[PDB]
């Protein structure tokens, strides 16, 4: 088992590495269709790289690279999309937001750190399972928490795994930077969940629409961090149609495997989206989801965050293009 995964570790040790500037990840509508889990892990190395965090927080080298590969192997392989590739798109949106979006001139590097680590810990060791499934399939982790249990578990495994061996990038942090780190990451991973985002977002939009937002008023700023977090948690929708076909029809088939679990180990009367029958009407039910979080968040992420506009546009392009499959 592990012998093959560590053979993949030699694939890290013995394969060509295309540059991130060659691999279009700065382009928000990037083609992740051709990347392997290894290459996406390498892009994740870029995501820890350019955010000026390793210099500001003294991250260890290979401990970080194999932070990335360990989080890579830890995902259960039965899962469709909600694996390492999900973290790839999420922290793609995060890295792109904090560099291509050029927000660093605004918000502090501490916050860049919280944004990045919470972005890669938006969905650690995701089991093809959202909060509700364990809330009703009753995995022990569910009883271990209450609200946003997968994400309370993602903060739990943030503070745990980063303190766990092979992952101590927090080791170089000063106690203040470390404190702001795990705390802002706590609230943000709570907000990496789209839900507690829906909870926290209203104060943000009230503080954004009037162009009265200010970064010398730090709680509002951290709230912006959380908004970017949730903006990143669903970033897979930003991808191009030949690819997005794969991505959101794996949203289809993966919530249809999870939905098979919703109609075997759960046996609920089917809801329209995760019912397989609506293969020709699922995408509209994505839109009602997409409008519920994506566009609403990327509008504010448009009026404040700037170059991050395509992160909105790269989603909207899918709309009618999925409506086509939603139109049988």
């Amino acid at each position, epitope marked *: 088992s592990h012998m093959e995964e560590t053979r993949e570790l030699q694939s890290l040790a013995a394969a060509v590495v295309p540059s991130a500037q060659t691999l279009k990840i700065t382009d928000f509508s990037f083609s992740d269709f051709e990347l392997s889990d290894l290459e996406t892990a390498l892009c994740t190395i870029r995501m820890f790289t350019d955010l000026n965090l390793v210099q500001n927080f003294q991250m260890k080298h290979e401990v970080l690279c194999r932070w990335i590969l360990s989080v890579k192997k830890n995902y259960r392989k039965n899962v469709a999309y909600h694996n390492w590739r999900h973290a790839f798109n999420t922290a793609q949106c995060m890295f792109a937001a904090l560099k291509a979006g050029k927000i660093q001139n605004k918000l502090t590097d501490l916050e860049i750190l919280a944004l990045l680590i919470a972005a890669l810990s938006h969905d650690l060791d995701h089991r093809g399972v959202n909060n509700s499934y364990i809330q009703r399939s009753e995995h022990p982790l569910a009883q271990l928490y209450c609200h946003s249990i997968m994400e309370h578990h993602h903060f739990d495994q943030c503070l745990m795994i980063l303190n766990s061996p092979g992952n101590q990038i927090l080791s170089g942090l000063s106690i203040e930077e470390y404190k702001t780190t795990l705390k802002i990451i706590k609230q943000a991973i709570l907000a990496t969940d789209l839900a507690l985002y829906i909870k926290r977002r209203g104060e943000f939009f009230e503080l954004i629409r009037k162009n009265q937002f200010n970064l010398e008023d730090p709680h509002q700023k951290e709230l912006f961090l959380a908004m970017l977090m949730t903006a990143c948690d669903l970033s897979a929708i930003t991808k191009p149609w030949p690819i997005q076909q794969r991505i959101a029809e794996l949203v289809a088939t993966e919530f249809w495997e999870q939905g098979d679990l919703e109609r075997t180990v759960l046996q609920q009367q089917p809801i329209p989206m995760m019912d*397989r029958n609506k293969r020709d009407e699922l995408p509209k039910l994505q839109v009602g989801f997409i409008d519920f979080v994506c566009t609403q968040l990327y509008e504010a992420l448009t009026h404040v965050s700037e170059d991050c506009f395509p992160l909105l546009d790269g989603c909207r392009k899918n709309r009618q293009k999925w409506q086509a499959l939603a139109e049988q």
Partner: antibody, heavy 113, light 108 residues
Framework: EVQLQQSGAEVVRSGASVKLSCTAS????????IHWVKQRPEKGLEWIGW???????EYVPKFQGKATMTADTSSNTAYLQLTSEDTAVYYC??????????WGQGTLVTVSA | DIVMTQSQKFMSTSVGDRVSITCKAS??????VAWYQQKPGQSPKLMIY???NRYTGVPDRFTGSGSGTDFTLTISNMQSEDLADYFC?????????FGAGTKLELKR
């Protein structure tokens, strides 16, 4: 060898419904699509309808309003409640759910008054 | 929809001869193709899946391919057991459709 199985040759009276079966074996259909089909002799195995892991029945219009499927995934079974062409060999198969391979003998129904 | 017509039915060819069980999709199906070993009054077996990949337990002497539209189950090293029905199927698209069947015959 992995195999589906069904009732053998039967001679029902005209106007009398005949309760067909499709007992899959050698694999759980608990994760699989199941597809009923008809064979009027030496012709295309004309389609009847199908059922998914969702457990909801589905029919061809030819058998919709006529045929009455009752199927279950954990039981790996698909019943099919039901002319000289209907006097036929009814087959049924399967498919992986992630996918977009085994058969019963084909129930030889014979309808005549 | 996509009918799986088979012009092949009752060819009379000698044992060990190569033979082709033609079939034809009316529309594109991709590589998602499934050949089958039918018998009257008795259980059919799978022959081929994914255009090329073969059924578990059927002999490899058979060949079975074709894709998109044109299809052909070219039985090779044909035997008397091979002289039974065969039908093409798409698992590619709903409703699934099926071959006319083809009861191969030994030549004499």
């Amino acid at each position: 060898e992995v195999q589906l199985q069904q009732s053998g040759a039967e001679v029902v009276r005209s106007g009398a419904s005949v309760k067909l079966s499709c007992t899959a074996s050698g694999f759980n259909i608990k994760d699989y699509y199941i597809h009923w089909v008809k064979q009027r002799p030496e012709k295309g195995l004309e389609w009847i309808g199908w059922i998914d892991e969702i457990g909801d029945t589905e029919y061809v219009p030819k058998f919709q309003g006529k045929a009455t499927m009752t199927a279950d995934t954990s039981s790996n079974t698909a019943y099919l409640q039901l002319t000289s062409e209907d006097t036929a060999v009814y087959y049924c198969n399967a498919g992986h759910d992630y996918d977009r391979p085994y058969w019963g003998q084909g129930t030889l129904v014979t309808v005549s008054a | 929809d996509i009918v799986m017509t088979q012009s092949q039915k009752f060819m009379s060819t000698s044992v060990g001869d190569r033979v082709s069980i033609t079939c034809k999709a009316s529309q594109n199906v991709g590589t998602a193709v499934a050949w089958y070993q039918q018998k009257p009054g008795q259980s059919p077996k799978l022959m081929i899946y994914s255009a090329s990949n073969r059924y578990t337990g059927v002999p490899d002497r058979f060949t079975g391919s074709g894709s998109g539209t044109d299809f052909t189950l070219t039985i090779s090293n044909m035997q008397s057991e091979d002289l039974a029905d065969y039908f093409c199927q798409q698992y590619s698209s709903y409703p699934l459709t099926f071959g006319a069947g083809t009861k191969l015959e030994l030549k004499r």
